[PDB]
Amino acid sequence: AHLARRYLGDARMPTFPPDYGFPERKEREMVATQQEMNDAQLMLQQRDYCAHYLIQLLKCKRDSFPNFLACKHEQHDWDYCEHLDYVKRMKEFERERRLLQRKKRREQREAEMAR
Amino acid sequence: SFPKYKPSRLATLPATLDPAEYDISPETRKAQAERLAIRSRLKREYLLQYNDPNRLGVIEDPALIRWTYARSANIYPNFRPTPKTSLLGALFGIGPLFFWYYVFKTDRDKKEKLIQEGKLDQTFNISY
Amino acid sequence: EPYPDDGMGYGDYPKLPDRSQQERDPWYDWDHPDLRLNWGEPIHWDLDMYIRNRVDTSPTPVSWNTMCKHLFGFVAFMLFMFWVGEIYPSYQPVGPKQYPYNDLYLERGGDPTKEPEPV
Amino acid sequence: SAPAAYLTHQQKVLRLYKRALRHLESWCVHRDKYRYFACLMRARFDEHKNEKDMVKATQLLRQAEEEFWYGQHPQPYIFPESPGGTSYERYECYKVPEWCLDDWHPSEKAMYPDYFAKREQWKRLRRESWEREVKQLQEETPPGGPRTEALPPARKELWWHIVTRPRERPM
Amino acid sequence: SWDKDVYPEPPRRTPAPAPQTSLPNPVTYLTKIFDLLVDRPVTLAREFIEQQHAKNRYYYYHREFRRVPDITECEEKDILCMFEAEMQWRRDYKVDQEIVNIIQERLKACQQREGESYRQNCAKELEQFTQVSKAFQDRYSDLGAHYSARKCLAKQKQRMLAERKAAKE
Amino acid sequence: TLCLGAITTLFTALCAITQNDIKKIVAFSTSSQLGLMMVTIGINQPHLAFLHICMHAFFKAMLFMCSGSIIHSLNDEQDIRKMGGLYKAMPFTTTALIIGSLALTGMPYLTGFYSKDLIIEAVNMSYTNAWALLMTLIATSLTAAYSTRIIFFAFLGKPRFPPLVLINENNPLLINSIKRLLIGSIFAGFIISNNIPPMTVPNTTMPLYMKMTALIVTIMGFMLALELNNTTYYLKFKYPSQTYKFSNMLGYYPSIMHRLPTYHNLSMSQKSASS
Amino acid sequence: HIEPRYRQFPQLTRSQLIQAEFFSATMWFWILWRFWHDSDAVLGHFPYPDPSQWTDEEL
Amino acid sequence: YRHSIFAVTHVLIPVWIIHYYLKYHVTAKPYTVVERKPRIFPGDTILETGEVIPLMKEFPDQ
Amino acid sequence: MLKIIIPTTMLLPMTWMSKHNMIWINATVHSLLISLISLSLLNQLGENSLNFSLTFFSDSLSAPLLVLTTWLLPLMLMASQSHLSKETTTRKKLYITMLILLQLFLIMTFTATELILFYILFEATLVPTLIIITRWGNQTERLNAGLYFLFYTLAGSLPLLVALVYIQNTTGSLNFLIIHYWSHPLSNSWSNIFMWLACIMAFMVKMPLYGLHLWLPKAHVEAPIAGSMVLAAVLLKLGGYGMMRITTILNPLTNYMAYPFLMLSMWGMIMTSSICLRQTDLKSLIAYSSVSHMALVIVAIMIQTPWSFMGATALMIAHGLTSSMLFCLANTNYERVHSRTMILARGLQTLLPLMATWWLMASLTNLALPPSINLIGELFIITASFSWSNITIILMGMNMMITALYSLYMLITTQRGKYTHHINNIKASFTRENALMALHILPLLLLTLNPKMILGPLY
Amino acid sequence: SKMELPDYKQWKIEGTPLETVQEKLAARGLRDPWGRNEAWRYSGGFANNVSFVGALLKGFKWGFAAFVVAVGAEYYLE
Amino acid sequence: PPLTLEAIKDRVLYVLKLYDKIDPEKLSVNSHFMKDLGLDSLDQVEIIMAMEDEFGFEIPDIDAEKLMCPQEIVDYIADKKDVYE
Numbered sequence A: 001a002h003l004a005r006r007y008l009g010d011a012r013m014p015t016f017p018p019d020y021g022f023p024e025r026k027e028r029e030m031v032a033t034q035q036e037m038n039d040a041q042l043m044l045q046q047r048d049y050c051a052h053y054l055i056q057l058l059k060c061k062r063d064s065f066p067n068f069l070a071c072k073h074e075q076h077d078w079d080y081c082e083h084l085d086y087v088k089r090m091k092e093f094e095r096e097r098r099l100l101q102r103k104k105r106r107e108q109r110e111a112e113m114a115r
Numbered sequence B: 001s002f003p004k005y006k007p008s009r010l011a012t013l014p015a016t017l018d019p020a021e022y023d024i025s026p027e028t029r030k031a032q033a034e035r036l037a038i039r040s041r042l043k044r045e046y047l048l049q050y051n052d053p054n055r056l057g058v059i060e061d062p063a064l065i066r067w068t069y070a071r072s073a074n075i076y077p078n079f080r081p082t083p084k085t086s087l088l089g090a091l092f093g094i095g096p097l098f099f100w101y102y103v104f105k106t107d108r109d110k111k112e113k114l115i116q117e118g119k120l121d122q123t124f125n126i127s128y
Numbered sequence C: 001e002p003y004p005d006d007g008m009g010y011g012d013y014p015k016l017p018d019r020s021q022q023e024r025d026p027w028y029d030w031d032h033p034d035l036r037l038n039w040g041e042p043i044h045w046d047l048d049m050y051i052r053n054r055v056d057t058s059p060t061p062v063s064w065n066t067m068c069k070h071l072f073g074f075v076a077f078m079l080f081m082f083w084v085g086e087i088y089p090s091y092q093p094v095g096p097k098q099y100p101y102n103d104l105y106l107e108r109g110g111d112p113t114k115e116p117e118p119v
Numbered sequence D: 001s002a003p004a005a006y007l008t009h010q011q012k013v014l015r016l017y018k019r020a021l022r023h024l025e026s027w028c029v030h031r032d033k034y035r036y037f038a039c040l041m042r043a044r045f046d047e048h049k050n051e052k053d054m055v056k057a058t059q060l061l062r063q064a065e066e067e068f069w070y071g072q073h074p075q076p077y078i079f080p081e082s083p084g085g086t087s088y089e090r091y092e093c094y095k096v097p098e099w100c101l102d103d104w105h106p107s108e109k110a111m112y113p114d115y116f117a118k119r120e121q122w123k124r125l126r127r128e129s130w131e132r133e134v135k136q137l138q139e140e141t142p143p144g145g146p147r148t149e150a151l152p153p154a155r156k157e158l159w160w161h162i163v164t165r166p167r168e169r170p171m
Numbered sequence E: 001s002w003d004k005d006v007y008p009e010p011p012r013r014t015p016a017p018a019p020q021t022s023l024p025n026p027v028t029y030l031t032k033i034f035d036l037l038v039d040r041p042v043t044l045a046r047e048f049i050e051q052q053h054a055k056n057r058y059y060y061y062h063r064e065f066r067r068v069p070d071i072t073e074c075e076e077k078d079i080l081c082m083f084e085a086e087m088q089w090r091r092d093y094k095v096d097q098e099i100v101n102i103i104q105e106r107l108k109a110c111q112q113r114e115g116e117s118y119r120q121n122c123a124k125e126l127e128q129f130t131q132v133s134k135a136f137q138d139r140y141s142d143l144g145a146h147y148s149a150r151k152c153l154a155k156q157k158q159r160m161l162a163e164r165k166a167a168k169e
Numbered sequence F: 001t002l003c004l005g006a007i008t009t010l011f012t013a014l015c016a017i018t019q020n021d022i023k024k025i026v027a028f029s030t031s032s033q034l035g036l037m038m039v040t041i042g043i044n045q046p047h048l049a050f051l052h053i054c055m056h057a058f059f060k061a062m063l064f065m066c067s068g069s070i071i072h073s074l075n076d077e078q079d080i081r082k083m084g085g086l087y088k089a090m091p092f093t094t095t096a097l098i099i100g101s102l103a104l105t106g107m108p109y110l111t112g113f114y115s116k117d118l119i120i121e122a123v124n125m126s127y128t129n130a131w132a133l134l135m136t137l138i139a140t141s142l143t144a145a146y147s148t149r150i151i152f153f154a155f156l157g158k159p160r161f162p163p164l165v166l167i168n169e170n171n172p173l174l175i176n177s178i179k180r181l182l183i184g185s186i187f188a189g190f191i192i193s194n195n196i197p198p199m200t201v202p203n204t205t206m207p208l209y210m211k212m213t214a215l216i217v218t219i220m221g222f223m224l225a226l227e228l229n230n231t232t233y234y235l236k237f238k239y240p241s242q243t244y245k246f247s248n249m250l251g252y253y254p255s256i257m258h259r260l261p262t263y264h265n266l267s268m269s270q271k272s273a274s275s
Numbered sequence G: 001h002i003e004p005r006y007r008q009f010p011q012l013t014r015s016q017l018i019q020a021e022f023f024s025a026t027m028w029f030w031i032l033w034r035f036w037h038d039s040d041a042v043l044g045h046f047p048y049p050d051p052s053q054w055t056d057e058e059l
Numbered sequence H: 001y002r003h004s005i006f007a008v009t010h011v012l013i014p015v016w017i018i019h020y021y022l023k024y025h026v027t028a029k030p031y032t033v034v035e036r037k038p039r040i041f042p043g044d045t046i047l048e049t050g051e052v053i054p055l056m057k058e059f060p061d062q
Numbered sequence I: 001m002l003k004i005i006i007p008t009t010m011l012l013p014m015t016w017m018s019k020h021n022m023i024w025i026n027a028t029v030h031s032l033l034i035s036l037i038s039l040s041l042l043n044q045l046g047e048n049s050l051n052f053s054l055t056f057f058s059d060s061l062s063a064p065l066l067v068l069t070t071w072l073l074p075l076m077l078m079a080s081q082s083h084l085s086k087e088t089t090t091r092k093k094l095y096i097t098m099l100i101l102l103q104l105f106l107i108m109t110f111t112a113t114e115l116i117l118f119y120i121l122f123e124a125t126l127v128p129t130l131i132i133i134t135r136w137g138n139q140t141e142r143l144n145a146g147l148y149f150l151f152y153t154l155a156g157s158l159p160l161l162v163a164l165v166y167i168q169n170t171t172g173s174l175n176f177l178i179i180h181y182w183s184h185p186l187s188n189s190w191s192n193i194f195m196w197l198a199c200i201m202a203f204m205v206k207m208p209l210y211g212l213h214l215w216l217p218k219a220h221v222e223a224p225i226a227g228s229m230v231l232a233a234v235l236l237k238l239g240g241y242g243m244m245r246i247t248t249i250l251n252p253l254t255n256y257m258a259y260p261f262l263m264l265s266m267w268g269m270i271m272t273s274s275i276c277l278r279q280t281d282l283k284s285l286i287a288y289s290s291v292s293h294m295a296l297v298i299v300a301i302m303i304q305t306p307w308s309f310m311g312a313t314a315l316m317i318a319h320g321l322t323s324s325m326l327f328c329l330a331n332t333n334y335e336r337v338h339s340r341t342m343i344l345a346r347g348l349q350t351l352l353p354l355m356a357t358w359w360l361m362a363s364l365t366n367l368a369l370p371p372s373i374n375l376i377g378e379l380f381i382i383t384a385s386f387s388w389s390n391i392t393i394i395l396m397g398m399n400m401m402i403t404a405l406y407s408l409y410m411l412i413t414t415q416r417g418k419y420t421h422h423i424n425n426i427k428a429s430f431t432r433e434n435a436l437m438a439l440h441i442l443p444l445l446l447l448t449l450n451p452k453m454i455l456g457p458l459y
Numbered sequence J: 001s002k003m004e005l006p007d008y009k010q011w012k013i014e015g016t017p018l019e020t021v022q023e024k025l026a027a028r029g030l031r032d033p034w035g036r037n038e039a040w041r042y043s044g045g046f047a048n049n050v051s052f053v054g055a056l057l058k059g060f061k062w063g064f065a066a067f068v069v070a071v072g073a074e075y076y077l078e
Numbered sequence K: 001p002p003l004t005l006e007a008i009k010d011r012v013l014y015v016l017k018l019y020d021k022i023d024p025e026k027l028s029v030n031s032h033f034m035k036d037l038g039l040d041s042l043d044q045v046e047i048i049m050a051m052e053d054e055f056g057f058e059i060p061d062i063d064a065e066k067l068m069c070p071q072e073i074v075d076y077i078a079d080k081k082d083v084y085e
């Protein structure tokens, strides 16, 4: 399946970024702050862009001796943001899919115009 | 049923399936009578030994001594040179150790060529 | 039953049929019930390998070769199916099923610093 | 406890019966189904050749052994005392032979005056008895056949062996 | 804790920082205060020992050994030069081992001290450890058992020949 | 790690489907759990892998102790096929074994859930070899399988243990024991999943059958195993198929890997070396 | 304290059954209270085909 | 009283002793005990105030 | 030291002049005392090897061994002193003299210093142990055994002797210190190779090597236990001590000649251990276990890495104590039932418990599990071996397999299981028995607390 | 303090499922002597097997109610 | 259940009573099994296995061959359980 895109590949993905004028710049949100992240430690796995909600969560959790009680609102903030990110990194695959697809179509049709 | 059991060195056939268990002739019945005869002979003996007050101490059965003897002292005096045993002995003997000789020696040479002509030497390996 | 004359050097000793001690009747009242072998009865050469706690050559309802074939074949199928599985990872798969199996990509993230924060 | 005897056909087919019947329970599990198939089974043994000439019969056994061996089930139910057993010798750690107590030395032996008293009574009974079992064994025996043990006739009867086995669950 | 204050201390990267942040629920950690009373006993107890310990204090102090000329300059047959210089070289060797022990301990300290980060200050110690273990690896490698100063010499000339063979090209 | 942990879950669970000892079944179970958590490590999620143990202990200790109550009660008869149907004879042990079996099964808010679901779900959403994931699926089915086997034969039937009934659940310390483990067995999943810092960082999006799969596989387990088990109840003698003899011979593995190499060595150590 | 019978199984003490029933009920009470306290079997919706305008294609 | 003396020994003595051993080994030597060092969030440290929140550009909820 | 050595001589007059029924107490008490005096030697130094007279010195390598060797005499006395009783007074009094004379030769031959003095004592040890094996061993074979024990030593030792003389002619002094300093490489050719084997083969005989070990089992089968404890726990170890000594010379040639012996050893360990897995009788089983461990020492010496010598020392001592322990612990059964064959003992645990406990401790440290000095002694040499060749682990691992099995085996076969019925002979454990083996095993366990004094010179 | 044996007479087979089996053997005409023994103690007395799923729902009848009390507390908090 | 001889003889007959082929009135502890009562061995195996099954006790086959008189049976279990009552 030529149309199908391999998971390992990052994507024509580089071209696609250039291809979509609106998408550039990626300007990915960076409210995390690298110097600050070290102070709270976290984990290397827990880098993410939603790290700030995570810091809000550890703050809230340490703040309450109630333990199991409360602090689900922060957990929902971290949750919901994590969801939005998963959706973004989901749509990107659909993007590389459809763009590889068009690449195949416009290549086939260019193969027609050139016969 | 159809499939039939197939006996092997590690799975001896059950006595119930042995054909010899069935076919039976009066002289063979004399064989069983004999086996019970000697078995009863010896067990009667062992009971005469086992429980009279005066024995106190252990009473080893001769057969076990023949066995322990035959697991050691009797092996060499017999021997006999035979080419099957001799070759088999050369094989199990010198064989595997030559094998290990090459197997270690090559690796040694390999580490030599890497440490010296190469430079893939381990770092931090200061302990030695 | 001498072994018979042979260079192994054990001679004039009865050759007895192989029989792990489980095979001999438990219900009989043996002189030596753990050894399970009365008194003067001559002892099998490899007594100790059949002494129980060691090899047990007890008869088995399914035949030996069938045993071997079923298991070794089973492990074989297990491995080959496994590695053909390895060829086609989830969210990648054979392309045909991959038409459904495709998803995520997703994994890329992190501040560019994390590319060297780990460095 | 009834040693030896070279085997005979009747008892043979019988043991095949108890055996097959037991594995048959091992399959049928429920008391119900087991009852049904059991009755069906004995019905097979009678409905077949409950009477016949021998030469056919042995062949019928050779059939039966196969037919069983195929169906014998990977593992039958086994009562714990039995050689399979979930506890075939769980208690053999404990069954110390009596002569060993005969060793405790007086500071211990004083503590059970009664039991020891009765015990010397016994040991006396044996050491007194033994020559009689000697003469009798010497008497009843031919050169020495398959049979084990011989009847009492006036006293005692090789008893010390069995009579003073250390019961079953000493602890 | 003068030893804690000694050589590792200027390397020691102590800082620490409590946060303190109360909220609506009562704090479980207050139980530690009860537990603190359990400490207090021993605290008082230490005085009951320490006081007496102060009363008499005969004491030791450090020993040190003077420098001696090395094997390289004593002649091919004097045993006494080879010997004095041998003992000196040996002391020096054991010392160097102790130093590598220290730098490793500081490495362990940095490793645990990080919460989860590291690849940080631990990279700093990791570097000096890299240099130190490098050179120590160099000075004292394939000497084998019966390591001896004459041999470390015999190695040092080899590396120097490596240098001269290097400069030529 | 994954490559092997999966197949040990499967291969063990299969033998677990068809045994007769209480304890052998529970043993194959525990090893199968171990294979599962082993892929949990092999799936690169160590934290949950540890998390599963802490839940697992309560479950298994529950099972073996209630089983100990049964076994001691009856003068020690491990074999289920003559284990009685004693659902009422020992009601408290019954309760215990039920919550236990449900916990191991992975019921949605009971303690075993907080491990198992998070696990297998994470395996689903992870990039990985799939065939192993399949093995995780059949395995988690078979969990429900043997777990229903032991319930069925232990309790439901009209009793078939030999007559006299020495049965006596009573003896307060035992009661207190099982009590405490039940307590942990129900609260600990929630309490601990709550208290621990979120090292996991949750995956919670596509799709819906993602979360359902853990339940439906279980349900298939109970339906198939139970309808099958009831079909065993309808007379008609049959004789075993080869698969039965296989999976009930523990995979043949002990009977070949023990009677063989040991023979070649112990022979070799006399046929040659000693001699 | 309990007697052998030969079929009856004199199931001693109501308290036993009280306990057993108590824990079974305790179980369902927990699973249900937790079921109402939250539905953890679901959370946020997800979708696939989305919109081509969001991505890229042109012609 | 049985529970008294029993608990006295088995829980009171070991902790006194071992904590005294604690002042020994920890006060004596470096790196005998190495803390993870506390996570420090945006909130001020007790060591010396400081610390600050970042941006808070996040929007919408639930 | 010359101080410890005199009293050791002095017990002899004390033995001969002792009252006829009191001698055991004399020899026991004073041997214990002299052990404690031996213990003060242990101090050593962290740098220079300790020195004394011109003719003795005390390297750290020797000291733990010396302490051990002094320690064993009382033990052999406690074992012996019920084994023999019916013997005439003059003969018994003659008998302990063999033992003490023997250890005297050991205390001399450990502190060395000249390698010719060290040799002549190294070979002088041969006589008393021969006399003991031959006169007080049981059963016929002992006679033949004497010969195997003997010539295998001499056939090894004699060339070593000539070689020694040679060197002190090709160089200056034969003394150990200077030769440690004046050492210069010998290399290839062909004369130098025969020099190599000449300076190794005797030491590699006295600690059995796999191709040559045949005398050792057949010694242990025969010797009265006092001979067994020494023949196992010590002489092997001293052969190792000497071989560790002479390796001050050699090099670089060792790099080239190690291989064949590393093959006989690396293979012989797995092999002999395998034979060990199926003996008929216990007293031999222990012996092959002993060879199976000595192979580890000998590769540990030949790879010549410092870790390997550390492990060498530790394993030498640990195996010393554990092997002697298993021997006395087996002789007890042999006296209680005269079976010798392991199968007859059967359910010995049932009839008496505490011995089962000693079986447990002893076998348990035979397999070597942490943190027994046996284990830690073994793990180092696996480390250095692994450095020497990454493959080598696959061999070492198999050892650690089989040494488990047979060890546990000797436990479970001669203990756990049913009592034999008719064997009424057993009689409930003497105090001296428990005393004896407690004396083996306690030092062995305390010793783990302070390895740093046993690891030896390359610590 | 021996317990008494119950009764020889009292073990009727008629109520048993086994009676159906004896009927089925009657179809073969075969005799099954043991049933009055086997069926008596087991199937014929207390025996009345609990339903599987019903066994699973052993606590539900009370738990749903206490749960109702719980949600009642929920609204009560409102 | 420390068990007693009366309990054994009672439970045994109590099982023999339920067997159909025996007519309960004719049953006696000393009542013989073949010369009295025509039950034959093929049913004898049934009565013995079914009877041991009551106890969970196991009967070795050669001992199963004797059997016959119920008193001989109660004697047998009396030996194996060592009741001495």
Ligand SMILES: CCCCCCCCCCCCCCCCC[C@@H](O)O[C@H](CO[C@H](O)CCCCCCCCCCCCCCC)COP(=O)(O)OCC[N+](C)(C)C
Pocket: B081, B082, B083, B086, B087, B089, B090, B092, B093, B094, I211
């Ligand atoms: C350290 C471990 C040791 C390992 C084993 C040590 C050595 C084992 C190998 C032995 C070497 C060969 C001797 C074996 C016997 C040969 C002499 C004779 O007895 O053998 C004849 C039979 O044996 C064979 O003819 C000899 C085969 C020899 C081949 C094996 C050599 C393997 C090489 C070993 C290495 C050599 C050392 C090199 C230095 C590394 C039997 O004699 P006989 O019955 O009357 O006449 C023959 C009867 N026919 C006519 C019917 C046949």
